[PDB]
Amino acid sequence: SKLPLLTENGGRVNRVGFTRLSREGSIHKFGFFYEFTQESLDFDSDDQLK
Amino acid sequence: MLNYNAPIDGQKSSIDGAGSDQMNTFYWLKKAIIQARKDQYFMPLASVTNM
Hints:
With 50 residues, chain A is largely without helices or strands. In chain A, 8% of the residues lie in helices and 0% in strands.
């Protein structure tokens, strides 16, 4: 039914169109921290606790 | 803040959790405090007679 059958007299027939979509993506932030007191590193059994 | 607390008196250090504790908690000076011989009179005033 929808075949572009074009005759011999031509004319404005069989016109088409075009589209386009778009994608997306965002950026988030992460992070964490830990705490220590100097004594807990100076007076300690293990040398390289850090 | 993980603090050293006091392992000697019983309080476990913060990083030492569950069944653990500090494993070098003092210092051995390794220099014993010994006493010398008591002063000895009587003994050096003595002649000997061999048997």
